[PDB]
Amino acid sequence: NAEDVVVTITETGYAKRTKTDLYRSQKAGLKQDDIVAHFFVCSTHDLILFFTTQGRVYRAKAYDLPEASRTARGQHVANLLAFQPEERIAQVIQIRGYTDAPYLVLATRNGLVKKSKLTDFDSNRSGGIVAVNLRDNDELVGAVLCSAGDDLLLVSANGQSIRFSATDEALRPMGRATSGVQGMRFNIDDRLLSLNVVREGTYLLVATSGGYAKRTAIEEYPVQGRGGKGVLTVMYDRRRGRLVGALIVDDDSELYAVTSGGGVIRTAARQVRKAGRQTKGVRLMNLGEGDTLLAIARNA
Ligand SMILES: [Ca+2]
């Protein structure tokens, strides 16, 4: 019954598993409908944690996802997990068990953060468990596994960034039902775009709605105290637009740039100009004149 599988969840919200041998076996212009938001290799009997925008976490075994192969869509996650109305996926984390890392750290749209012991989430309660108490106009945006020795990076849509060390002193572990503490401070005009764990030798790739992208080595993000305004990670220009993509990449990463007009461009991280934190980005190759960028996705 226990098999190795590839789990795929589309950006459109459909989930399936595929036996790894069949997946490999099943190896045209790219279509937005086929963009995969979450992809990993695991056991049928591993757990998948679905963190929602409303700050809940629903768990499922990988075998709870339907078998379908590479062409078929699978089941929509909101039906499979019985999400509340309007509830959407914010992040998905696959685990072998609740000791995979010491902590889960969550980050909210309005810049709040919280560390909780991962074992606090080991509950068979159905219908979703609260992972963070949100104010009425907040949403959960990020969730990562980490240890007290890690640094975290928060990036906002307007291009602020803050890096701080997730020590016990900086971020005391809190219960699931509690509210977050301030992670980055910004006004109503800004909102958090991404949360990531700092890893040596990687880059933060940012991209604006106007199609301008760059990647900056992670070592150029300065460590600061939690809760500040942070530092800029883009040279802002009215015409170039706000950020649409905040993500960590390495030299070998492959990405999909989702454009206006229903388009998708294959963009390797090696095509994206390595530059400084506040150096202007470079227009993505194969972006048509007048076309804009909606998102940056990963390619397996
Ligand atoms: Ca294309």
TrEMBL record:
Keywords attached to this entry: Antibiotic resistance, ATP-binding, Coiled coil, Cytoplasm, DNA-binding, Isomerase, Nucleotide-binding, Topoisomerase
Principal localisation: cytoplasm
Transmembrane domains' residue ranges: none
Keyword Protein biosynthesis: no
GO biological process terms on file: DNA topological change; DNA-templated DNA replication; response to antibiotic
Subcellular location: Cytoplasm
Molecular function as annotated in GO: ATP binding; DNA binding; DNA negative supercoiling activity
GO cellular component: chromosome; cytoplasm; DNA topoisomerase type II (double strand cut, ATP-hydrolyzing) complex
Domain of life where this protein originates: Bacteria
Reported function: A type II topoisomerase that negatively supercoils closed circular double-stranded (ds) DNA in an ATP-dependent manner to modulate DNA topology and maintain chromosomes in an underwound state. Negative supercoiling favors strand separation, and DNA replication, transcription, recombination and repair, all of which involve strand separation. Also able to catalyze the interconversion of other topological isomers of dsDNA rings, including catenanes and knotted rings. Type II topoisomerases break and join 2 DNA strands simultaneously in an ATP-dependent manner.
Additional record remark: Few gyrases are as efficient as E.coli at forming negative supercoils. Not all organisms have 2 type II topoisomerases; in organisms with a single type II topoisomerase this enzyme also has to decatenate newly replicated chromosomes.
Subunit annotation: Heterotetramer, composed of two GyrA and two GyrB chains. In the heterotetramer, GyrA contains the active site tyrosine that forms a transient covalent intermediate with DNA, while GyrB binds cofactors and catalyzes ATP hydrolysis.
Family: Belongs to the type II topoisomerase GyrA/ParC subunit family.
Protein's name in the database: DNA gyrase subunit A
Species: Mycobacterium tuberculosis (strain ATCC 25177 / H37Ra)
Name of the coding gene: gyrA
Range of the intact protein held here: 514 to 819 of 838
